[PDB]
């Protein structure tokens, strides 16, 4: 009931908005706040958390890019290795406010690995995600090189009352030239249907694959062969699961008809 309590309530609404409907939720919230100044100190951090965790996409002069925590250089600056640039972004207005060439943010000593992986992520993304936008980052770590692959794709048809998003973040670590590449993937799928109701699908899957670490080109190709197989299996498992749920738990809730297939005789009973 305190101003800060009312502030925490509204923060939770915002952070939990479904994909592609953030602004519809931001409007509802602002209209429920006794004073528009209540969140004039929490917003930035709040919107930033949503934008980056949803891995929203943006349009730059050189093409589409992703806003993620892995590409975050500053609170409002995001690296786009593919186009060697730094994107300045306004989290509250949800729009790009700057575009410049990178000047050292990209680690050149391992860039050949990042670049070899980037070619594969692009083709993979174009092949399995129609509206997908990708992002491949690179950095040196104790065990060698860490290549982070982000894929994010959404859909929004308010007229058809539904939205959805698919997020994939694969982190590939390896010693350059030998050994194996260990890829840890985290996939999240969200679907929202709201015609005469509100139904939501929410998934979170974590997988780990392994492949050979040799010449950059190969390391990338074989990492994506593994990653693509893992996701195909997960996708398959997800399709099967629909049947299982609807053919097991669902029918085990309310019968379509009583055990004797007859609509109750209300005059009797």
């Amino acid at each position: 009931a305190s101003n800060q309590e009312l502030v925490q309530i509204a923060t939770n609404f915002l952070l939990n908005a479904p994909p592609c409907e953030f602004m519809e939720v931001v409007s509802d919230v602002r209209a429920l706040l006794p004073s528009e100044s209540l969140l004039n100190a929490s917003a930035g951090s709040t919107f930033r958390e949503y934008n980056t965790s949803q891995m929203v996409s943006v349009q730059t002069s050189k093409g589409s890019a992703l806003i993620t925590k892995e590409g975050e250089i500053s609170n409002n600056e995001y690296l786009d290795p593919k186009n060697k640039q730094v994107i300045t972004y306004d989290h509250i207005k949800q729009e790009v406010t700057g575009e410049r060439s990178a000047s050292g943010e990209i680690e050149q000593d391992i860039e050949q690995y990042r670049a070899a992986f980037d070619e594969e992520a692009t083709k993979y993304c174009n092949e399995y995600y129609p509206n997908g936008v990708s992002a491949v980052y690179g950095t040196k770590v104790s065990e060698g090189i860490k290549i982070t692959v982000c894929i994010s794709t959404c859909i929004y048809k308010p007229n058809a009352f539904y939205s959805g998003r698919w997020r994939s973040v694969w982190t590939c670590t390896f010693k350059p030239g030998s050994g194996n590449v260990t890829s840890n993937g985290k996939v999240q799928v969200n679907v929202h249907y709201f015609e005469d109701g509100n139904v939501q699908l929410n998934t979170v899957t974590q997988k780990q694959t392994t492949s050979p670490s040799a010449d950059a080109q190969s390391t990338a190709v074989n990492a994506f062969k593994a990653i693509g197989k893992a996701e195909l299996n997960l996708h398959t498992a997800l399709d099967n699961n629909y049947s299982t749920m609807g053919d097991t738990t669902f029918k085990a809730l309310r019968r379509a008809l009583p055990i004797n297939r007859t609509k109750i005789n209300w005059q009797k009973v």
Partner: protein, 245 residues
């Protein structure tokens, strides 16, 4: 404030169904001048209570509530006990008992378990009532909650109009090493009005049962299409398994 009520309803249609309990409370804190409307137009999974007098379980909702207490459909008593509470009129209570009796049968036939509860409240010479069903099936688990608010307006002689606003809340959740953690949650609402001749043969309970049965059977099919067909369809347009090849 129609504007605020408008935003609350829209907001609740977008927020995660699984957090409905915490979220509704949040709204009450934000706009207390809407506590009545909110508690009335926003539904959520119901909690189960035990009637020690009747030795039976019953459902808790805003319809059998007075202050912080809840009225049992079997004993017609509140828990915790309190003075000055609200009970159905003598005649409406007789209908409430009959209603609870047949819907417990309906429960047996369509759910083969779970719990039922019907509460009626006077509306001058007219009346309204809520029919409740709750079932939880048991890694893969699911929960079903039905709430049917029926409004009866007596019409001069042996004929009444029955207004029904139904909502079914459904959730299923599984977590395994093949799909990872999967959660489906939500609800769907549908209305239907209908006139019927009520006699001692075609009692209100009978007319309510026919409407509840038809409505719940229709929501069932819609639930099935959406939960296991529409969501699947959306996922598969986000990701093309065979790929552009």
């Amino acid at each position: 404030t129609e504007k605020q009520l408008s935003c609350c309803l829209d907001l609740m249609r977008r927020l995660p169904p699984s957090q409905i309990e915490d979220n509704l409370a949040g709204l009450l804190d934000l706009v207390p001048d809407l506590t009545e409307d909110l508690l009335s137009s926003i539904d959520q999974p119901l909690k189960v209570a035990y009637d020690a007098v009747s030795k039976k379980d019953y459902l808790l909702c805003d319809y059998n509530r007075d202050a912080d207490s809840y009225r049992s459909p079997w004993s017609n008593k509140y828990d915790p006990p309190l003075s000055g509470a609200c009970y159905p009129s003598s005649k409406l209570r007789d209908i409430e008992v009959q209603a609870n009796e047949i819907f417990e049968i309906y429960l047996n036939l369509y759910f083969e378990g779970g719990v039922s509860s019907v509460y009626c409240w006077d509306l001058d010479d007219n009346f309204a009532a809520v029919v409740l069903m709750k079932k939880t099936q048991d890694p893969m688990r699911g929960t079903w909650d039905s709430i049917h608010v029926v409004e009866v307006k007596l019409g001069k002689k042996d004929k009444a109009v029955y207004k029904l606003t139904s909502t079914v809340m459904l959730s299923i959740e599984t977590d395994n090493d093949n799909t990872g953690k999967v959660n489906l949650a939500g609800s769907l609402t549908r209305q239907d009005e209908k006139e019927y001749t009520f006699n001692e043969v075609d009692t209100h309970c009978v007319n309510i049962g026919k409407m509840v049965e038809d409505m719940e059977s229709k929501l069932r099919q819609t639930l099935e299409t959406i939960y296991f067909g529409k969501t699947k369809e959306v996922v598969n347009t986000l990701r093309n398994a065979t790929g552009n090849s």
